[PDB]
């Protein structure tokens, strides 16, 4: 059973909820907000058996839907005047705090075969594909690991390998073996392990991982730079993400250092926990104070996230299956380059803009092409992409995803849609209904909902009914909320999820007993610009709201102008 | 994939809901309305490991709770002036339409706590069981995902959730074909080939490996019956109702053959089955449930039907399997049999319940079903009172004749809720939007009974830990109902989903013609008894309320029969 008193989070999230102690813990099934919809009722995804209809209509190929609706010419790309690319990157990093859906290891081999045999669910290629002319080819896809393998009885559900809580588990890990390996066990300073072979202008980099089949090595053979080791396994997927992970590692070590000065008699354990506790609170505050309001807009923010009252032990904090797909809205924010800038915020030469298809798993570009400062600068001073109904997502992810390290480039929009079918998620209208929103039955009604009859027509041509529209596709097709970057449906799902992660987290930073009133006063002062200042060689940063500020010099200030975190109230006699 | 058109229910309930076709089908996990509460978070029930507390307090022995709170002296028993014993029996029969939770080696003879056994420990100073090294046998319910460290243990419903008379027809296709008369093209159910009840049909016999009905008598050598549900023989009153509905099927198939001579056996079976199903729905929702819930809760939880809603989940909830056991408080300690003058039928007009369990011989050799049905109609149910919860015939002597020791059904109810990982009273109160008492004083207010509140806190320590059955049946009854607010909410909520989420609900456009629905509105359970037994005087009005001979009785000739005119075809 659970300790009747405790001071800190467990690593796995076990015991956050004392009455049902696995809720929000790692390696458990997702909760379902709606009953699953599988071709055979309990296991096989729609699109599995050729010729089998969904709810009266043919299943559209995920790749076909991507081609006809998501595809757009890259020269048309609209930059978001009101959002930085840091808005995109915080979303990915946050996602990697919340959910990871494990797949079986490459092994019959889904990566090299186009045979549809468990556990493979390859994406078929439509006729007249702009890229893949051989229709006997396919895009690789492994089905998500089931919670109960080989069962006839259970309705297939998938697994979340992370703690659902906003607890910085992407830094500290969600399993105890990994969480100990991430720590510096050389001394009693309560530090996280740092790279022993390289530094970034004197500052720390993430340790290297020891992988059986390391993909970062494939991106540059001569460089011989492996993937990094972090709390989450996807830390090296793009260098912008790596940058944020690195930034938070440093911030942990900085805090543990300052707490050692302040409380000299604290051992390594106490320093680690207390630093971890703060980093967690900082991720909560940036997310709920700065990030989410700009996702949802002010109306939805009031509706779905009213003022915090207190912890409610009857609120289920698990990640919902649908959330893993809906929170992928952020794929519409992705620019087709990685932007690097020098200390004058000027294109850092020789390669200021690297195509995304050449940065995936390219840990070598962090170690050998100037560290994280140029990348963080690019995030702060470049605009996000804007989602528009005829410019949904760029070809660097739709045509060339992981191009360097796979037999064929993937299509992330199409994977989003195959994945929703794999997970047995209901269609657009079922989720509309779940959210208390009107459900369009006809092309005209869908036109009204989308304020776009052209797009409504394309969707009905693919899907036949709005009942069958894949949740991602429908969600991101919707016109955006005032001062937000999602439509009503995604607002509802995302809002609902984050409310539960807050109200049902016993260690929420505002919950009575977690922090003293003076510590909460102090924590209210933190910001992400400040964290960049404290832990990089950057001295000019974005004005608050870092997710909106996107134009040099107009939206920038000196580091000296910003309030630091005062750790005075953490001192003990 | 589901047939895009169909006329009749599948046997398994597959394809009722076309978007999620397993919903309400047989042999699937229960739905959870709340997250499970297990000692280890995912599998072990509270009370499993000695010394491990629940939510700050020791776990009370289920048998101790039964002894201190459920036990009452049988001479104090209060009869319900407003409810027949038929009200009790229809509840059990309906339950056997909705849910059966299957179990799996050594649990029947061993008191060692080793999976899958979860034996009930005996407290000191037990009124009945003096040997503290003994125990009450208990098998844990089967898990949906055996041996998993990942999944939160959930249990299985072997029946169709729908109100579809699956206790008559079966919930699996092998069994459903064996229940049919495949000798001819009349669409009949199989009847007993060795015995009759004054010329009328009895249920076939089952072929069981370990048949308990044989143990009851022994010289009589009468095995258990075979029905849609495996529990048909558990008491003869239940057997009577099963038998009654078998006859009613065969009667309807007969009349439809006259009316439509060119219909084959399949068409007759399905069309008769369709009617019997509608009759079970109508008696349940029109006659039964209003008297369970009372008029307030009935309006709240079961407003006027509109139409089928394919987004309503019709699965049975895990908690319902335990909450709907409220009907154990309605059970009288005798089986009552009456002759055609409604007078004690000799020999043995009142048999102790501990001598009727699995006693199929008493149907075949002691006068058939007419005396039993008469006893149900003309005897009062027991009334649930806070100091008279459940009788010792089920608390002390359950299944005494057919196993090594008498069971305690109230205690099993409570061990079972822990087995299933159900939250305690307050979590369910909260789920229902009801106030959650934290102190003995608040619990006194809620129960309108400070004495009972004190006893419960002595056992449980907090209202958070009170077992759902125990808490539910402790609550004062609603005006003109026989459950409190919490059970009203759970039961009401469940039956609303079974109605609004059933594609084959009898009022749903397209199931029956408008003329067939006019005709079906006329059916009643008294009528069904008339049509299919040698009984000619039956209960008035609301059979579940009518409980006193002659005051509440009428002649069969006074009642309208079911007009099958609108079932005729060219
Ligand atoms: C601590 O947090 C608990 C969880 O709250 C939910 O999650 C949090 C994060 C917020 O988003 C909350 O706003 C959200 O509600 C709270 O407990 C919940 O309280 C509500 C209100 O009393 C309870 O609702 C009641 O549910 C009864 C049972 O029926 C429910 O379940 C069925 C199957 O699950 C489903 O068919 C029903 O639709 C219903 O589901 C609820 O729907 C309503 C509205 O869409 C929601 O408000 C509920 O959250 C849903 N619950 C679930 C579990 O999915 C109903 O009978 C009852 O409504 C009846 O009475 C009211 C007036 O009395 C009438 O308006 C209405 O006509 C109806 O007849 C009510 O809806 C809910 O079950 C509780 N959840 C749990 C886990 O117990 C706590 O209240 C909160 N405590 C504090 C101090 O803040
Ligand atoms: C756990 O935590 C500890 C403490 O925080 C980490 O210790 C650090 O290890 C790294 C790498 O293993 C060291 O970096 C190397 O530094 C040497 C020279 O060290 C000197 O200069 C430092 C510069 O600021 C200075 O801090 C050092 O002072 C400390 O150490 C001395 C002597 O032990 C001690 O007495 C003092 O009191 C201080 O504690 C010292 O003056 C440098 O030569 C190395 O160069 C490498 O890289 C180059 C390429 O640029 C390569 O070409 C070289 O040949 C070589 O490979 C390297 O930069 C760092 O000095 C350590 N810091 C401290 C505070 O001890 C430890 O790593 C953590 N473990 C894990 C797993 O994270
Ligand atoms: C057909 O039936 C559908 C299900 O009906 C339910 O069961 C039947 C038998 C009745 O009891 C009925 O009353 C039940 O509703 C029905 O769909 C349901 O419609 C409601 C209302 O639109 C939906 O509730 C809304 O849900 C969203 C999402 O949150 C829910 O899920 C989370 C996670 O599980 C829970 O924590 C929440 O408590 C919710 O349960 C909510 O965001 C939303 O509340 C917000 O918006 C409303 C309206 O503005 C505000 O009043 C609130 O304060 C919030 O701001 C609602 O709670 C429900 O999800 C939905 N269920 C399904 C399965 O879709 C359907 O409408 C019926 N249709 C017809 C045609 O008859
Ligand atoms: C490479 C990828 C990115 C590069 C910038 C990227 C970005 C984001 C943002 C901005 C997100 C949210 C705001 C976000 C969320 C989630 N993603 Fe996505 N993403 C990249 C790559 C992937 C890939 C590949 C997947 C898996 C696709 C598949 O179905 O096979 C992916 C998923 C997700 C996801 C679900 C996570 C999970 O539980 O497994 C998000 C919530 N991303 N990304
Ligand atoms: C013998 C038993 C009965 C009568 C002589 C009897 C009566 C009822 C009524 C009147 C019910 C509803 C109003 C009702 C519901 C449910 N019961 Fe209960 N019951 C008798 C015996 C049992 C036994 C034995 C069990 C199982 C005991 C255990 O848990 O160890 C039992 C259960 C149930 C039940 C749950 C059924 C399931 O899903 O498996 C009801 C809904 N009854 N009974
Ligand atoms: C088990 O079943 C047997 C029947 O198979 C039961 O035996 C029966 O007991 C009754 C007791 O009244 C006998 O009734 C008697 O019948 C005779 C002849 O008409 C009559 O003279 C007596 O006055 C009385 O009415 C019945 O005949 C007898 N049947 C047989 C075949 O022996 C037995 O009692 C059952 N087990 C029990 C209840 O312990
Ligand atoms: C199947 O149905 C037939 C016809 O309804 C049953 O046959 C009758 O059986 C009774 C007694 O068992 C006989 O006395 C009648 O003379 C038979 N009637 C006819 C028309 O043949 C048959 O027994 C049924 N089978 C089962 C298993 O119930
Ligand atoms: C692979 O990594 C090497 C580092 O090992 C990167 O480049 C090297 O190539 C640059 C390209 O202009 C040279 O200017 C560098 O001096 C050189 N560095 C070393 C140590 O050899 C190389 O560009 C990477 N390859 C690709 C195609 O990106
Ligand atoms: F640890 C993890 C990181 C990323 C994931 C991703 C989840 C979505 N599906 C694709 C997965 C990436 O798999 C890859 C990527 C590059 C490769 C590779 C396989 O073989 C050699 O080069 C899974 C596990
Ligand atoms: C689960 O854990 C138990 C208890 O230690 C172990 O005996 C069992 O073999 C494990 N099984 C699986 C399938 O993970
Ligand atoms: C039923 O008919 C009988 C005659 O068989 C008659 O005496 C009796 O009064 C009728 N009604 C009632 C209520 O018993
Ligand atoms: Ca987490
Ligand atoms: Ca049924
Ligand atoms: Cl879901
Ligand atoms: Cl290293
Ligand atoms: Cl905040
Ligand atoms: Cl368009
Ligand atoms: Cl700078
Ligand atoms: Cl439940
Ligand atoms: Cl037989
Ligand atoms: Cl009705
Ligand atoms: Cl025996
Ligand atoms: Cl009392």
SS3 state at A121: coil
Q: Do A55 and B19 touch (CB under 8 A)?
A: yes
Peptide bond into B116 cis (omega under 30): yes
For residues B239 and B360, the answer to whether their CB atoms sit within 8 Å is yes
What is the DSSP code string of B157-221? E-S-SSSS-HHHH-SSHHHHHHTB--SSSS-PBP--SS--BTTB--PPBP--SS-SHHHHSSSS-
Per-domain residue ranges of chain B: 28-424+467-567
In angstroms, the CA B33 to CA B47 distance is: 23
Residue A486 has a CB neighbour count (10 Å cut-off) of 26
Mutation choice for A interface testing from B35, B59, B422 by most A CBs within 10 A = B35
**Which residue, among A230, A242, A232, A227, has the nearest Cα to A193 in the 3D structure?**
A230
Architecture of domain B28-424+467-567 in this structure: Orthogonal Bundle (1.10)
- Chain A residues near residue B157 by CB distance under 8 angstroms: none
**Residues preceding gaps in chain B (C to N > 2.5 Å):** 104
> Which B positions 303-322 lie with beta carbon below 8 A of chain A?
311, 313
In angstroms, the CA B549 to CA B300 distance is: 34
Name A542's bridge partners: A556
Is there a binding annotation on residue B255?
no
In angstroms, the CA A409 to CA A356 distance is: 12
Is there a binding annotation on residue A169?
yes
In angstroms, the CA A567 to CA A525 distance is: 11
Alpha helices in A263-358 (DSSP H): 268-285, 292-296, 298-304, 323-326
For residues B22 and A42, the answer to whether their CB atoms sit within 8 Å is yes
The DSSP symbol for B139 reads B
Regarding beta strands B135-136 and B120-121, do their DSSP bridges make them parallel or antiparallel, or are they unpaired?
Answer: antiparallel
SS3 state at B71: coil
Q: Do B152 and A35 touch (CB under 8 A)?
A: no
- Please, what sign has the CA dihedral across residues B107, B108, B110, B113? positive
Scan for tokens 């195959």, then name that residue: A418
Question: CB pairs below 8 Å between A and B: how many?
Answer: 80
In angstroms, the CA A509 to CA A168 distance is: 13
Q: Do A153 and B20 touch (CB under 8 A)?
A: no
Beta carbon of A215 within 6 Å of any ligand 9 atom: yes
Task: Count the helices and strands in chain B (H runs, E runs).
Answer: 21, 10
Residues B495-506 as b/e (b if ≥16 CB within 10 A, e otherwise) read bbbbbbbbbbbb
For residues B398 and B392, the answer to whether their CB atoms sit within 8 Å is no
In angstroms, the CA B503 to CA A166 distance is: 42
Q: Do B311 and A37 touch (CB under 8 A)?
A: no
**Which residue, among B81, B87, B80, has the nearest Cα to B543 in the 3D structure?**
B87
In angstroms, the CA B402 to CA A293 distance is: 67
Atom nearest to A237 CA in ligand 4: 1
For residues B323 and B472, the answer to whether their CB atoms sit within 8 Å is yes
Is B191 an interface residue toward A (CB < 8 Å)? no
Experimental technique behind these coordinates: X-ray
Give the 3-state secondary structure percentages of chain B, helix then strand then coil, rounded to 5: 40, 10, 55
Which residue has the CA at smallest separation from atom 2 of ligand 11?
Answer: B555
Distance from the A213 Cα atom to the nearest Cα atom in chain B, whole angstroms:
27
Beta carbon of B149 within 6 Å of any ligand 10 atom: yes
In angstroms, the CA A248 to CA A528 distance is: 10
What are the phi and psi torsion angles at A553 (to 5°)?
Answer: -55, -10
Question: A407: which 2 tokens?
Answer: 């037999």
Mutation choice for A interface testing from B4, B19, B28, B144 by most A CBs within 10 A = B19
In angstroms, the CA A489 to CA A483 distance is: 15
In angstroms, the CA B10 to CA A434 distance is: 28
**Which residue, among A376, A365, A372, A391, has the nearest Cα to A90 in the 3D structure?**
A376
Q: Which residues contact A222 (CB under 8 A, 6 or more apart)?
A: none
In angstroms, the CA B328 to CA A384 distance is: 65
In angstroms, the CA A14 to CA B184 distance is: 62
In angstroms, the CA B234 to CA B95 distance is: 13
For residues B157 and B134, the answer to whether their CB atoms sit within 8 Å is no
* Intra-chain end-to-end CA distance of chain B, in Å: 33
SS (H, E, C) A161-174: CCCCCCCCHHHHCC
Long-range (24+ apart) CB contacts under 8 A made by B251-255 are B251/B531, B251/B532, B252/B276, B252/B564, B253/B186, B253/B187, B253/B188, B254/B186, B255/B564
Q: Which residues contact A415 (CB under 8 A, 6 or more apart)?
A: A62, A123, A139, A141, A401
For residues A281 and A523, the answer to whether their CB atoms sit within 8 Å is yes
Q: Do B41 and A29 touch (CB under 8 A)?
A: no
**Which residue, among A429, A441, A418, has the nearest Cα to A474 in the 3D structure?**
A429
Helix (H) or strand (E) holding A73: none
Residue A175 has a CB neighbour count (10 Å cut-off) of 17
- Chain A residues near residue B4 by CB distance under 8 angstroms: 56
In angstroms, the CA B105 to CA B538 distance is: 47
Question: B95: which 2 tokens?
Answer: 């339950």
Scan for tokens 């019956």, then name that residue: B225
Name B33's bridge partners: none
Distance from the B165 Cα atom to the nearest Cα atom in chain A, whole angstroms:
23
**Which residue, among A155, A148, A159, has the nearest Cα to A25 in the 3D structure?**
A159
In angstroms, the CA B370 to CA B359 distance is: 16
The DSSP symbol for A540 reads E
Name B352's bridge partners: B334
- Chain A residues near residue B53 by CB distance under 8 angstroms: 1
What are the phi and psi torsion angles at A354 (to 5°)?
Answer: -100, 130
| Count of residues making up chain B | 570
In angstroms, the CA A364 to CA A236 distance is: 10
Is there a binding annotation on residue A95?
yes
**Which residue, among B391, B337, B392, B374, has the nearest Cα to B359 in the 3D structure?**
B337
In angstroms, the CA B483 to CA B297 distance is: 10
Question: How close is the Cα of B400 to the center of ligand 22, in Å?
Answer: 9
Residue A570 has a CB neighbour count (10 Å cut-off) of 22
Is there a binding annotation on residue B249?
no
Question: A314: which 2 tokens?
Answer: 């009857």
What is the DSSP code string of A79-97? EEEEEEHHHHHHHHHHHHH
Beta carbon of A191 within 6 Å of any ligand 2 atom: yes
Residue B455 has a CB neighbour count (10 Å cut-off) of 18
- Give helix A239-262 / helix A268-285 axis angle, nearest 10°: 130
The DSSP symbol for B507 reads T
- Chain B residues near residue A37 by CB distance under 8 angstroms: 19-20
SS (H, E, C) A112-153: CCCCCCCCECCEECCCCCCCCCCCCCEECCECCCECCCCCCC
Name A159's bridge partners: A29
In angstroms, the CA A346 to CA A348 distance is: 6
Is A20 an interface residue toward B (CB < 8 Å)? yes
**Which residue, among B227, B196, B208, B238, has the nearest Cα to B365 in the 3D structure?**
B196
Distance from the B146 Cα atom to the nearest Cα atom in chain A, whole angstroms:
9
Residue A518 has a CB neighbour count (10 Å cut-off) of 12
Regarding beta strands A383-385 and A79-84, do their DSSP bridges make them parallel or antiparallel, or are they unpaired?
Answer: antiparallel
SS3 state at B429: helix
How many Å is the maximal CA-CA distance in chain B?
Answer: 74
Chain B residue with minimum CA distance to A157: B151
Is B27 an interface residue toward A (CB < 8 Å)? yes
- Give helix B85-98 / helix B236-259 axis angle, nearest 10°: 70
SS3 state at B344: strand
Question: A151: which 2 tokens?
Answer: 């069962």
For residues B80 and B385, the answer to whether their CB atoms sit within 8 Å is no
In angstroms, the CA A166 to CA A508 distance is: 9
Question: A428: which 2 tokens?
Answer: 């657009």
For residues B500 and B305, the answer to whether their CB atoms sit within 8 Å is yes
Beta carbon of A95 within 6 Å of any ligand 4 atom: yes
Question: How close is the Cα of A427 to the center of ligand 20, in Å?
Answer: 51
**What residues does ligand 11 touch, defined as CB less than 6 Å away?**
B 537, 550, 553-555
Q: CA distances (Å), B55 to each of A302, B251, B407, in order?
A: 34, 56, 29
**Which residue, among A54, A282, A64, has the nearest Cα to A168 in the 3D structure?**
A282
Atom nearest to A504 CA in ligand 1: 9
In angstroms, the CA A465 to CA A471 distance is: 13
Question: B81: which 2 tokens?
Answer: 């002036």
* Intra-chain end-to-end CA distance of chain A, in Å: 33
Mutation choice for B interface testing from A41, A149, A423, A434 by most B CBs within 10 A = A41
The yes-or-no answer on residue B96 being catalytic is: yes
SS3 state at A532: helix
Architecture of domain A28-41+64-102+144-427+470-570 in this structure: Orthogonal Bundle (1.10)
- Please, what sign has the CA dihedral across residues B38, B44, B47, B49? negative
Distance from the B523 Cα atom to the nearest Cα atom in chain A, whole angstroms:
36
Left if phi > 0, otherwise alpha if psi is -120 to 50, otherwise beta: which for A361?
Answer: left
In angstroms, the CA B446 to CA B434 distance is: 10
For residues B428 and B34, the answer to whether their CB atoms sit within 8 Å is yes
In angstroms, the CA A140 to CA B178 distance is: 48
Q: Do B313 and A35 touch (CB under 8 A)?
A: yes
Residue A398 C-beta-side C-alpha neighbours within 13 Å: 27
Name A354's bridge partners: A338
Helix (H) or strand (E) holding A372: none
- Give helix B265-282 / helix B236-259 axis angle, nearest 10°: 130
Give the resolution to one decimal, in Å: 2.6
Scan for tokens 């739709």, then name that residue: A398
Distance from the A6 Cα atom to the nearest Cα atom in chain B, whole angstroms:
14
Scan for tokens 């079906």, then name that residue: B520
What is the DSSP code string of A178-236? HHHHTB--SSSS-PBP--SS--BTTB--PPBP--SS-SHHHH-TTT----B--SSTTTT
In angstroms, the CA A317 to CA B6 distance is: 41
Is B5 an interface residue toward A (CB < 8 Å)? no
For residues B534 and B198, the answer to whether their CB atoms sit within 8 Å is yes
Is A302 an interface residue toward B (CB < 8 Å)? no
Q: What angle do CA B236, B242, B248 make, to 5 degrees?
A: 135
Scan for tokens 């149907």, then name that residue: B363
In angstroms, the CA B550 to CA B377 distance is: 11
**Which residue, among B459, B163, B489, has the nearest Cα to B326 in the 3D structure?**
B489
In angstroms, the CA B100 to CA A432 distance is: 35
Scan for tokens 């229902």, then name that residue: B432
Regarding beta strands B553-555 and A138-139, do their DSSP bridges make them parallel or antiparallel, or are they unpaired?
Answer: unpaired
Residues B520-552 as b/e (b if ≥16 CB within 10 A, e otherwise) read beebbbbbbbbbbbebebbbeebbbbbbebeeb
Q: Which residues contact B417 (CB under 8 A, 6 or more apart)?
A: B322, B467, B468, B469
Question: How close is the Cα of B413 to the center of ligand 23, in Å?
Answer: 20
**Which residue, among B229, B224, B103, B101, has the nearest Cα to B164 in the 3D structure?**
B229
Q: Nearest by CB to B42, from A22, A52, A314: name it.
A: A22
Q: Do A36 and B14 touch (CB under 8 A)?
A: no
Q: Do B55 and A18 touch (CB under 8 A)?
A: yes
Name B57's bridge partners: B54
- Chain A residues near residue B145 by CB distance under 8 angstroms: 147-148, 151, 153-154
Question: How close is the Cα of B402 to the center of ligand 22, in Å?
Answer: 6
For residues B501 and B309, the answer to whether their CB atoms sit within 8 Å is yes
- Chain B residues near residue A4 by CB distance under 8 angstroms: 56
**What residues does ligand 8 touch, defined as CB less than 6 Å away?**
A 220, 222-223, 364, 368
**Which residue, among B182, B160, B248, has the nearest Cα to B240 in the 3D structure?**
B248
What is the DSSP code string of A485-506? SS-HHHHHHHHHHHHHHHHT-T
In angstroms, the CA B340 to CA A496 distance is: 64
The DSSP symbol for A368 reads T
In angstroms, the CA A245 to CA A535 distance is: 12
Distance from the A304 Cα atom to the nearest Cα atom in chain B, whole angstroms:
20
Beta carbon of A400 within 6 Å of any ligand 4 atom: no
- Chain B residues near residue A1 by CB distance under 8 angstroms: 39-40, 52-53
Atom nearest to A319 CA in ligand 4: 38
Beta carbon of A184 within 6 Å of any ligand 2 atom: yes
Chain A residue with minimum CA distance to B156: A153
Scan for tokens 């400040």, then name that residue: A530
């Amino acid at each position: 059973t659970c300790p009747e008193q405790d001071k800190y989070r467990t690593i796995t999230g076990m015991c956050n909820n004392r009455r049902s102690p696995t809720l929000g813990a790692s390696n458990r099934a997702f909760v379902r907000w709606l009953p699953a919809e599988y071709e055979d009722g309990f296991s096989l995804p729609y699109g599995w058996t050729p010729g089998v209809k969904r709810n009266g209509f043919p299943v559209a190929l995920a790749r076909a839907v991507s081609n006809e609706i998501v595809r757009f010419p890259t020269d048309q790309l609209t930059p978001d005047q009101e959002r930085s690319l840091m808005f995109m990157q915080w979303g990915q990093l946050l996602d990697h705090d919340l959910d990871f859906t494990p797949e079986p290891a490459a092994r019959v081999n889904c990566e090299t075969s186009c045979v549809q045999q468990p556990p493979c669910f390859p994406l078929k290629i439509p006729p007249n594909d702009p890229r893949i002319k051989n229709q006997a080819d396919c895009i690789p896809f492994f089905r998500s690991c089931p919670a109960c393998p080989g069962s006839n009885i259970t309705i297939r559900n998938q697994i979340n390998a992370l703690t659902s809580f906003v607890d910085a588990s992407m830094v500290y890990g969600s399993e105890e073996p990994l969480a100990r390996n991430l720590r510096n066990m050389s001394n009693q300073l309560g530090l996280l392990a740092v790279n022993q072979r390289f530094q970034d202008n004197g500052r720390a980099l993430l340790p290297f991982d020891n992988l059986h089949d390391d993909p970062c090595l494939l991106t540059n053979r001569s460089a011989r730079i492996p993937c990094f080791l972090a709390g989450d396994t996807r830390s090296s997927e793009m260098p912008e993400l790596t940058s944020m992970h690195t930034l938070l590692l440093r911030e942990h070590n900085r805090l543990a250092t300052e707490l050692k000065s302040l409380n000299p008699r604290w051992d390594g354990e106490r320093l680690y926990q207390e630093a971890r506790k703060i980093v967690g609170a900082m991720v909560q505050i940036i997310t709920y104070r700065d990030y989410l309001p700009l996702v949802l807009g002010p109306t939805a923010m009031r509706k779905y996230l009213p003022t915090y009252r207190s912890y409610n032990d009857s609120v289920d904090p698990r990640i919902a299956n649908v959330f893993t797909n809906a929170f992928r809205y952020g794929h519409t924010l992705i620019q087709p380059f990685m932007f690097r800038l020098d200390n004058r915020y000027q294109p850092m030469e020789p390669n200021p803009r690297v195509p995304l298809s050449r940065v995936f798993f390219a840990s070598w570009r962090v170690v050998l092409e100037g560290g994280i400062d140029p990348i963080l600068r690019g995030l702060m001073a470049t605009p996000a992409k804007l989602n528009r109904q005829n410019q949904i997502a760029v070809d660097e992810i739709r045509e060339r995803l992981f191009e360097q390290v796979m037999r064929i480039g993937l299509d992330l929009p199409a994977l989003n849609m195959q994945r929703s079918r794999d997970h047995g998620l209901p269609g657009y209208n079922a989720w509309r209904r779940f959210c208390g929103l009107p459900q369009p039955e006809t092309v005209g009604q869908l036109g009204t909902v989308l304020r776009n009859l052209k797009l409504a027509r394309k969707l009905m041509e693919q899907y036949g009914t709005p009942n069958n529209i894949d949740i991602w596709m429908g969600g991101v097709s919707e016109p955006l909320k005032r001062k937000g970057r999602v439509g009503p449906l995604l607002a509802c799902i995302i809002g609902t999820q984050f409310r539960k992660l807050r109200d049902g987290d016993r260690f929420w930073w505002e919950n009575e007993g977690v922090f003293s009133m003076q510590q909460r006063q102090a924590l209210a002062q933190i910001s992400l610009p400040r964290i960049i200042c404290d832990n990089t060689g950057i001295t000019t940063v974005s004005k608050n709201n870092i997710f909106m500020s996107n134009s040099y010099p107009r939206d920038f200030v000196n580091c000296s102008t910003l309030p630091a975190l005062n750790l005075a109230s953490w001192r003990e006699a």
